[PDB]
């Protein structure tokens, strides 16, 4: 109901966790679990590559169609572009329904 | 047919054509299936008149919308038929259920 593709078997959850590296244990045995760990974080790169099937249009429509366009009118910032502080912003929600089809 | 001031005269025109096409790829607005007059008659000895094709589009009152599609029908490939020529096509119905003709 939020829009999208209903999948009985969706793309699976990809779960990630730093392995606990303990600090130095006591030189005598303690049966209690470790509460002291070396503080650490991880970083790295992640790649997703999705292949999408397209459905081309076969309209015999004469007049031109509504399409998503940028405006040529000047502005302080180009849409879908970083500003002078390096902050990327998206100005408006772009839906996907621009071409037409007869019922 | 020539109207000359007193009497309608009707003559053959042997070198004149008639343009026929089928919209077999469903890229014109489909006006059939709306219970309109002008079908074939129930009785085989009756001569009928071919109804004029017309379609409706999007409106905002009696005005037009930018998404309103205009369809030129001379922008389709049509077969031109003089006397002596004929037109033929076949069609296969898709797998539809039986109409339940019982109580």
Swiss-Prot record, chain B:
AAV capsids serve as viral gene transfer vectors that have been shown to affect long-term gene expression and disease correction with low toxicity in animal models, and are well tolerated in human clinical trials. It comes from the Viruses. Signal peptide: none annotated. Transmembrane segments: none annotated. It is found in: Virion; Host nucleus, Host nucleolus. Belongs to the parvoviridae capsid protein family. Capsid protein self-assembles to form an icosahedral capsid with a T=1 symmetry, about 22 nm in diameter, and consisting of 60 copies of three size variants of the capsid protein VP1, VP2 and VP3 which differ in their N-terminus. The capsid encapsulates the genomic ssDNA. Binds to host cell heparan sulfate and uses host ITGA5-ITGB1 as coreceptor on the cell surface to provide virion attachment to target cell. This attachment induces virion internalization predominantly through clathrin-dependent endocytosis. The N-terminus of VP1 is sequestered within the mature capsid. It contains a phospholipase A2-like region and putative nuclear localization signals. The ratio at which VP1, VP2 and VP3 proteins are synthesized in vivo is about 1:1:10, which is the same as in the mature virus particle. This is Capsid protein VP1. It comes from Adeno-associated virus 2 (isolate Srivastava/1982). The gene is VP1. The chain holds residues 323 to 425 of 735 of the full protein.
């Amino acid at each position: 109901l939020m829009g999208g593709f209903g999948l009985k078997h969706p793309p699976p959850q990809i779960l990630i966790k730093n392995t606990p590296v303990p600090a130095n244990p006591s030189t005598t045995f303690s049966a209690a679990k470790f509460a002291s760990f070396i503080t650490q974080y991880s970083t790295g790169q992640v790649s997703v590559e999705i292949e999408w099937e397209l459905q081309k249009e076969n309209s015999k429509r004469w007049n031109p169609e509504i399409q998503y366009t940028s405006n040529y009118n000047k502005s302080v910032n180009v849409d879908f572009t970083v500003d002078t502080n390096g902050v990327y912003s998206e100005p408006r929600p772009i839906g996907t329904r621009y071409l037409t089809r007869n019922l | 047919v020539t109207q000359n001031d007193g009497t309608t005269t009707i003559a053959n025109n042997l070198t004149s054509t008639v343009q026929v096409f089928t919209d077999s790829e469903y890229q014109l607005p489909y006006v059939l299936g709306s219970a309109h007059q002008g079908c074939l008659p129930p009785f085989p000895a009756d001569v009928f008149m071919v109804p004029q094709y017309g379609y409706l589009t999007l409106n905002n009152g009696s005005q037009a919308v930018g998404r309103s599609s205009f369809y030129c029908l001379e922008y389709f490939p049509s077969q031109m038929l003089r006397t002596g020529n004929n037109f033929t096509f076949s069609y296969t119905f898709e797998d539809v259920p039986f109409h339940s003709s019982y109580a």
